[PDB]
């Protein structure tokens, strides 16, 4: 039936309704640390993000997004493998039932316990539905996090959860700033791929940051509490929101250190 991480309708099944899910440049992958290039010419990453208006949190079923105003550059990503302007859209997580799982991405087929998704798209394309229909449409920061101390920055978001339990409910949102989400080093691995989630279009450069951020066991509990079902549902805990690894093709992923 509709698309989901149940045994019924998880990740294996999604090829039925979406044949791209077989495809040559599918997403997340396992970034093998030894036979990644290191390339030169490769330029350092530019976050601004000083900017940024967020409005509203929502929870869509599978996870929950925190939206930001995308009518101007207001935050950016530029640099790094890109050509062009990527505005900021919205931000959401991949995680697990358990710590030792729960990230898209592996390194060196290790699993964090959640992952972070910047989604930013192509201003050249006018907007986001249309940015998904070319190569080079989308830019997807992706963070990993591993359980450890709190970070401060995240409380916010944790706080708000309780709003939005169920699918469809929504909180507004103002005044958050995603820069209290990176990492100190912008250090990052980069592969052409596409969105992990139907309708799995290939038109992301993903950008993995090297370095993970921490959060406490209890801050990850929160997210742990979402459901996957609307309100007078029977409750389904919207736990384990991630894609497995998918075979790396004709491509090369690059890295921006040695
Ligand atoms: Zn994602």
Not at 46 to 64: E, K, P
Not at 78 to 102: A, E, N, V
Not at 110 to 118: I, N, Q, R, V
Not at 221 to 232: C, H, I, P, S
Request: charged share 25%; with cysteine; proline share 7%.
């Amino acid at each position: 039936h509709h698309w989901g991480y149940g045994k019924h309708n998880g990740p294996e099944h999604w090829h039925k309704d979406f044949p791209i899910a077989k495809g040559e440049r599918q997403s997340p992958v396992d970034i093998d640390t030894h036979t990644a290039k290191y390339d030169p010419s490769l330029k350092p990453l530019s976050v601004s993000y000083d900017q940024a208006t967020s409005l509203r949190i929502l929870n869509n079923g599978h996870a929950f997004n925190v939206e930001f105003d995308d009518s101007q550059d207001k935050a950016v990503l530029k640099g790094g493998p890109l050509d062009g302007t990527y505005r900021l859209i919205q931000f959401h997580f991949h995680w697990g039932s358990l710590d030792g799982q729960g990230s898209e991405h592996t390194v060196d087929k290790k699993k964090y316990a959640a992952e972070l998704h910047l989604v930013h798209w192509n201003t050249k394309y006018g907007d986001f539905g249309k940015a998904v229909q070319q190569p080079d449409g989308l830019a997807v920061l992706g963070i990993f996090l591993k359980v450890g101390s709190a970070k401060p920055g995240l409380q916010k978001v944790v706080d708000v959860l309780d709003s939005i339990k169920t699918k469809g409910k929504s909180a507004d949102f103002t005044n958050f700033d995603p820069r209290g989400l990176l990492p100190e080093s912008l250090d990052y691995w980069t592969y052409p791929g596409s969105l992990t989630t139907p309708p799995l279009l290939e038109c992301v450069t993903w950008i993995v940051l090297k370095e993970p951020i921490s959060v406490s066991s209890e801050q990850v509990l929160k997210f742990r509490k979402l459901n996957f079902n609307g309100e007078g549902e029977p409750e389904e805990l919207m736990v384990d929101n991630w894609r497995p690894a998918q075979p790396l093709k004709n491509r090369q992923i690059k890295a921006s250190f040695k």
